[PDB]
Design a protein around this ligand. Structure first.
Ligand SMILES: NC(=O)C1=CN([C@@H]2O[C@H](COP(=O)(O)OP(=O)(O)OC[C@H]3O[C@@H](n4cnc5c(N)ncnc54)[C@H](O)[C@@H]3O)[C@@H](O)[C@H]2O)C=CC1
Ligand SMILES: NC(=O)C1=CN([C@@H]2O[C@H](COP(=O)(O)OP(=O)(O)OC[C@H]3O[C@@H](n4cnc5c(N)ncnc54)[C@H](O)[C@@H]3O)[C@@H](O)[C@H]2O)C=CC1
Ligand SMILES: [Mg+2]
Lengths: 333, 332
């Protein structure tokens, strides 16, 4: 039996965590959840305790922490502190079309590997002259190489064929150029994977017209998480897509996007798919592949039935009813 | 009759400029073209500038229509020079679905308004130590205030009901915080326009699901024009999207957001829709609404019939034929 840190989070996080525990009990999953909370306080003690719990357990499942963008600049983002302190350098998101969820595009299968410790997370802002705010960001060879290293290894091990570096080296000649060159260095050691590059501007335009062309994407921690959110939107939105954060020793699992769903919280309507699929990726990281396959298959089979769909994807079902169908598919196995 | 400065530009530029001149002539538009072929020189010392001839023209005429221009081979672009000379502080990019040209997004009517002097443009990159690169970007109170004022002014003058400020204030607390602060101040004056704030990543998430919710989007330049490009992708791409840059001293330069297209720069192939619709924006900015509506309708009707479309839109026809058919319909 493994012990895993659980951060319930804000909004729909706590209610979705209960449903995960419920699914886990019914599937006889040898995992016990050790809960730590991250409140809205200006004091950093809560997030530091959370980091401490992750160092001990090495693995976490989390809901999403509310960001208040009206608090003083001294109050840094709690999720990003978690990401930098634990050195979770590889953010991995899998946007894949679900047959039963009909959107404007079919046959999307994109793995996005985003650098998750540098770039925007290294940002320093100062107002040393009144009315002038200057920002200073870092891109490095060491962090660019290990993200590229991660994306290619993932590509080869998943039976993928193409890695596309998404960048703005046409404008940021030194920084994004350095990132691009680090991807090229790694590409030389992976002759079975096709390496390509695309300007971020052109990537977003291609995504809304022909997203089928993309396989694996690798990118620095820049351009405001546009690509991840576009791709999440294309396949049906934040209710569906799971995210993972990997370091050399630690791993943290979550929904692809940061939305807490505050306005729909405690109304039994949140889509549980993303969170359930996040817990499956967690199970795979723990080498509990059999349990991951059972739950994942149940989730996807359930999503094939539109009566189980929640309002975010045009359905009329409740969360608890979708959880009921998931548990039913598990018990049949 | 009114004089506007025409910069024909490079590659497909001269072809599409000639096309626009022809449509305007056929529509009996009160426009005369002052051609200015602008190439970078060195004036006082080694400092790069636009020719006096071209500067005198634009300062006088105030209105400019511009084809695409090249990036220099060796390291100071013409677009940068025009931007700094006339202080083009507001980039306006309307995105409207075209009835004839079907994409998976049919309900799009979005105007992006982007700060055009800072962010990406104020940047310096440099090497800290080997394999460590730092970028430095700037946002100011004055420029944020100016773009916010412009966005609400545009919303009034173009019968728009909603202005959404787009930010990443979770990461960029100080700079986007300053942007939102200044947007909020302007919103207090203009209560006739509904104001809201949205995370950039949430805008992108929703845009792709339902672009109909969005009206006017205002943003700083920290991420360049990526959001505008997303919106462009919804309606058919760079071949159809118009753009305007509004500056100091009444100066406004209108242009296509697409490049020179050197691969198809060979005679009679390029889509002139994008430049034409920028010229339509120019007419509206000049108060020539009747000529704007007619030229606009003639272009849309030509696309709707779809029997003489350019190669980029799926047709087999060439530029001059497409141009000729718009000239045909605008006479009525
Ligand atoms: N990058 C970041 O850090 C972001 C943080 N947030 C946080 O979230 C709060 C706002 O909440 P939002 O969720 O943006 O809007 P909201 O509070 O109105 O909640 C409804 C939204 O939740 C989303 N959602 C997420 N997961 C869902 C699920 N499983 N089922 C159904 N709908 C789901 C839907 O897109 C829907 O529009 C903000 O106060 C902020 O703290 C929001 C967006 C980005
Ligand atoms: N505002 C401006 O003056 C801009 C200038 N450029 C310049 O253009 C040059 C090349 O840049 P890229 O982005 O690679 O070029 P681009 O933006 O033209 O690339 C888009 C692609 O779509 C096609 N395309 C573009 N416009 C078209 C039209 N009107 N009709 C039919 N097909 C069209 C082209 O074949 C090209 O492969 C650079 O030197 C750059 O400085 C680029 C963007 C804006
Ligand atoms: Mg662009």
């Amino acid at each position: 039996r493994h012990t895993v840190t659980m951060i319930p989070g804000d909004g729909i996080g706590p209610e979705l965590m209960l449903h995960v525990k419920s699914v886990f009990r019914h599937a006889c999953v040898p995992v016990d959840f050790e809960e730590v909370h991250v409140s809205s306080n200006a004091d950093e003690e809560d997030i530091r305790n959370a980091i401490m719990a992750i160092r001990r357990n090495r693995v976490a499942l989390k809901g999403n922490i509310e960001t208040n963008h009206n608090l003083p600049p001294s109050h840094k983002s709690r999720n990003n502190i978690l990401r930098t302190s634990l050195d979770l350098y590889a953010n991995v998101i899998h946007c894949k079309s679900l047959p039963g969820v009909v959107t404007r595009h079919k046959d999307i299968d994109i793995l996005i590997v985003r650098e998750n410790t540098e770039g925007e997370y290294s940002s320093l802002e100062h107002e040393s002259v009144a009315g002038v705010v200057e920002s200073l960001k870092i891109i490095t060879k060491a962090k660019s190489l290990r993200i590229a290293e991660y994306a290619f290894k993932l590509a080869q091990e998943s039976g993928r064929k193409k890695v596309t570096a998404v960048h703005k080296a046409n404008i940021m000649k030194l920084g994004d150029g350095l990132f691009l060159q680090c991807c090229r260095e790694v590409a030389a050691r992976y002759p079975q994977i096709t390496f390509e590059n695309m300007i971020v501007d052109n990537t977003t335009m291609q995504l809304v017209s022909r997203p089928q062309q993309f396989d694996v994407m690798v990118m620095p921690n820049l351009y405001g998480n546009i690509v991840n959110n576009v791709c999440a939107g294309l396949v049906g939105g934040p209710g569906l897509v799971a995210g993972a954060n990997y370091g050399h020793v630690y791993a943290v699992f979550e929904t692809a996007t940061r939305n807490t769903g505050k306005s729909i919280a405690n109304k039994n309507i949140a889509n549980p798919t993303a969170t359930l699929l996040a817990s499956c990726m967690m199970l795979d990281h723990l080498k509990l592949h059999s349990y991951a396959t059972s739950i994942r298959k149940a989730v996807l089979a359930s999503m094939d039935n539109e009566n189980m769909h929640t309002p975010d994807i045009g359905g009329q079902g409740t969360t608890s009813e979708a959880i009921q169908d998931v548990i039913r598919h598990i018990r049949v196995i | 009759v009114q004089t506007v400065t025409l910069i024909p530009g490079d590659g497909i530029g001269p072809e599409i400029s000639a096309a626009v001149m022809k449509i305007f002539d056929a529509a009996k538009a009160p426009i005369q073209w002052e051609e200015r072929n602008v190439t970078a020189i060195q004036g006082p010392g080694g400092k790069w500038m636009i020719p006096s001839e071209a500067k005198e023209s634009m300062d006088k005429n105030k209105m400019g229509l511009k084809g695409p221009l090249k990036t220099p081979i060796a390291a100071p672009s013409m677009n940068l020079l025009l931007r700094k000379t006339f202080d083009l502080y507001a980039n306006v990019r309307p995105c409207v679905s075209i009835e004839g040209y079907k994409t998976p997004y049919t309900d799009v009517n979005i105007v992006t308004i982007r700060e055009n002097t800072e962010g990406e443009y104020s940047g310096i990159e440099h090497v800290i130590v080997d394999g460590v690169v730092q970028s430095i970007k700037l946002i100011t109170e004055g420029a944020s205030k100016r773009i916010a004022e412009f966005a609400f002014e545009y919303a009034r003058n173009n019968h728009r009901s909603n202005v959404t400020a787009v930010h990443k204030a979770n990461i960029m607390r100080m700079s986007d915080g300053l942007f939102l602060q200044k947007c909020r101040e302007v919103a207090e004056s203009c209560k006739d326009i509904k104001f809201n704030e949205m995370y950039l990543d949430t805008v992108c998430l929703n845009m792709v699901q339902d672009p109909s919710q969005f009206d006017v989007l205002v943003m700083p330049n920290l991420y360049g024009d990526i959001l505008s490009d997303l919106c462009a992708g919804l309606i058919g791409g760079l071949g159809v999207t118009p753009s305007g840059n509004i500056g100091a001293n009444g100066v406004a330069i209108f242009e296509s957001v697409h490049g020179t297209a050197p691969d198809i720069a060979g005679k009679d192939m390029a889509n002139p829709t994008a430049l034409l619709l920028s010229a339509v924006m120019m007419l509206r900015h000049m108060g020539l609404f009747d000529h704007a509506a007619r030229i606009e309708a003639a272009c849309f009707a030509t696309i709707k019939d779809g029997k003489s479309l350019t190669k980029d839109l799926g047709g087999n026809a060439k530029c001059s034929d497409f141009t000729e058919e718009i000239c045909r319909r605008v006479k009525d």
